[PDB]
Design an enzyme around this catalytic site. Structure first.
Site, mmCIF file in Angstrom:
data_model
loop_
_atom_site.group_PDB
_atom_site.id
_atom_site.type_symbol
_atom_site.label_atom_id
_atom_site.label_comp_id
_atom_site.label_asym_id
_atom_site.label_seq_id
_atom_site.Cartn_x
_atom_site.Cartn_y
_atom_site.Cartn_z
ATOM 1 N N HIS A 210 1.057 -1.357 -0.044
ATOM 2 C CA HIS A 210 0.439 0.288 0.170
ATOM 3 C C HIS A 210 0.737 1.613 -0.101
ATOM 4 O O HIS A 210 0.005 2.129 0.330
ATOM 5 C CB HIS A 210 -0.908 -0.198 0.880
ATOM 6 C CG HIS A 210 -0.430 0.330 2.083
ATOM 7 N ND1 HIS A 210 -0.235 -0.193 3.296
ATOM 8 C CD2 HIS A 210 0.056 1.482 2.386
ATOM 9 C CE1 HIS A 210 0.344 0.114 4.412
ATOM 10 N NE2 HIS A 210 0.204 1.230 4.187
ATOM 11 N N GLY B 227 2.750 5.985 10.112
ATOM 12 C CA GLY B 227 3.956 6.280 9.329
ATOM 13 C C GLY B 227 5.365 4.881 10.020
ATOM 14 O O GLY B 227 5.865 4.865 10.024
ATOM 15 N N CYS C 51 4.044 1.742 9.153
ATOM 16 C CA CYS C 51 3.720 0.363 8.472
ATOM 17 C C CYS C 51 4.950 -0.197 8.513
ATOM 18 O O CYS C 51 5.811 0.953 7.601
ATOM 19 C CB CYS C 51 3.058 0.812 6.971
ATOM 20 S SG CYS C 51 1.191 1.308 7.041
#
Lengths: 5, 306, 306, 5
Positions: free
Chosen positions: C41, C143, C145
């Site tokens: 993603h 942030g 991920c």
């Protein structure tokens, strides 16, 4: 007592 | 979102751990530049440990009485001094992995990470608070001495603790990296006991601010309190007294949630009195005192979930 | 003595963290040998994230659509494939800090360490359990991920989790290092919810064994129970059913404390029924389910305090 | 909803 490690 | 007891990443510290042997006592040391620090009780045998004289035990040793292994490589000792309740061993190699660092003494209520080591070999990392009675509720087995506590501010490692011993309570006592104990304790196997402890008021309040920033509000109430009226209540539940300095430190968290400190104390005053009603704050069914205000700013969002 | 939620030392993992940017989305990646893994993603904008087609968004990108920074040094992308819900970026440098490692999928109830990162920069380490409903109660901001979960067995890093998203509950969902989610979740911003969760019976029992090994016995009782009679009780308090495999895993802890498993279940059966009487086990006023039996053998003494 | 991070 006490245990020094 | 979420809120965990979070420790600092430990890599920069792993590279300073070594093993130090003297006779048949083995414990851990910390290798910065060309010096290795460790507890001075490394020069004691079990019989010695009840009534040691260190000045006198240490003159009966030379540099080559000390074995320093880092991983596989043997480091040669070329110097040794006592510093309070630590030794300093000058060695022949400077540690290629020495990070930017400093030593600080920490104050009760402050917080830090511990890297648990056995035989110079890091086994785990966890987050601690220095208790008011100067102990820590660590987790340590035999051979953990010389395990260190630290913080990281940017690129820099603040060493603040070295492990020396375990009390009858099951809690731990140690030293700053200058050798000065935290607490009234001494490095001897004698009768010694934690002083009674107290809950860290500043921290509980930090933690209530964290609940609100995460978006939970149920424990609030419409009251306010005088600092002194709170303290009368605090003393009966064995909390540290709140002071004006503590109130001022809670400023940016006050500002971020629009809750006045003294309103939040009123909230706590209420929780102490009526319990939680079998409910939770940030996951906990009890009031949590091992996050400082700084611990909350670092972990939490700078934006409140209103 | 003592018992803490302990995470693995994180150094070997810090050296694989990098930053990965695509358009104006930035998240973290993991650099092993000459490959960097990250959530897929990363190729989405905020508008895309509600109804993405990844097959279709990805063909509209080339190698130089991806920026990979490790500290300062820019790494050049020379290849890209999708793997389930991850990307794999071949780069021009092999990571000089690649540790011995493997990827494993973990089972609910199992446990691991998380290294929280922002912009490729490790910020903290904490210990987690994979919940029965396949979420984790992490602590993550925007942030985070591409932050990974892991275990260390000896010298070897077992990667088992990569962070992808946060649920409305405030809990976290992600993936193994093959891209396959844990749980029924998908990498889209839609209506999605944790399934209801259950308490990890195997773990609670591990944790009771840890109390005894540390030398606390108050919660024991003189009863025994049939596995099935326990389960009838377990189902009413929302615990997982105990199985024979779970009973067998508790063997060495049974052997170390001389408490039979089924005697210990009787002890738990009692705690569930009558509460703790405002008392504590290993510091806790509640029953603790995020230490496995293995977590207890590793942390605790191999010798019981009888 | 759901928040990818």
């Amino acid at each position: 007592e006490s245990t020094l490690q | 979102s979420g809120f965990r007891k979070m420790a600092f990443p430990s890599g920069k510290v792993e590279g300073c751990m070594v093993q130090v042997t003297c006779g048949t006592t083995t414990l851990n040391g910390l290798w910065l530049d060309d010096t290795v620090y460790c507890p001075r009780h490394v020069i004691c045998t079990a019989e010695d440990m009840l009534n040691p004289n260190y000045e006198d035990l240490l003159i009966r040793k030379s540099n080559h009485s000390f074995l320093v292994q880092a991983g596989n490589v043997q480091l040669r000792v070329i110097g040794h001094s006592m510093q309070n309740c630590l030794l300093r061993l000058k060695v022949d190699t400077s540690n290629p992995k020495t990070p930017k660092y400093k030593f600080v003494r920490i104050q009760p209520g402050q917080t830090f990470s511990v890297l648990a080591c056995y035989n110079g070999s890091p086994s785990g990392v966890y987050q601690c608070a220095m208790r008011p009675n100067h102990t820590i509720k660590g987790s340590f087995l035999n051979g953990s001495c010389g395990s260190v506590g630290f913080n990281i501010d940017y690129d820099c490692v603040s060493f603040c603790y070295m492990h020396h011993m375990e009390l009858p309570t099951g809690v731990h006592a140690g030293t700053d990296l200058e050798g000065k104990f935290y607490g009234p304790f001494v490095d001897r196997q004698t009768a010694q006991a934690a002083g009674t402890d107290t809950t860290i008021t500043l921290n509980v309040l930090a933690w209530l601010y964290a609940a609100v920033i995460n978006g939970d509000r149920w424990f609030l109430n419409r009251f306010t309190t005088t600092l002194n009226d709170f303290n009368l209540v605090a003393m009966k539940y064995n909390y540290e007294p709140l002071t004006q300095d503590h109130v001022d430190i809670l400023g940016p968290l006050s500002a971020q949630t629009g809750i006045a400190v003294l309103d939040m104390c009123a909230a706590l005053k209420e929780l102490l009195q009526n319990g939680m009603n079998g409910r939770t704050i940030l996951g906990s069914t009890i009031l949590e005192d091992e996050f400082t205000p700084f611990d909350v700013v670092r972990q939490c969002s700078g934006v409140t979930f209103q």
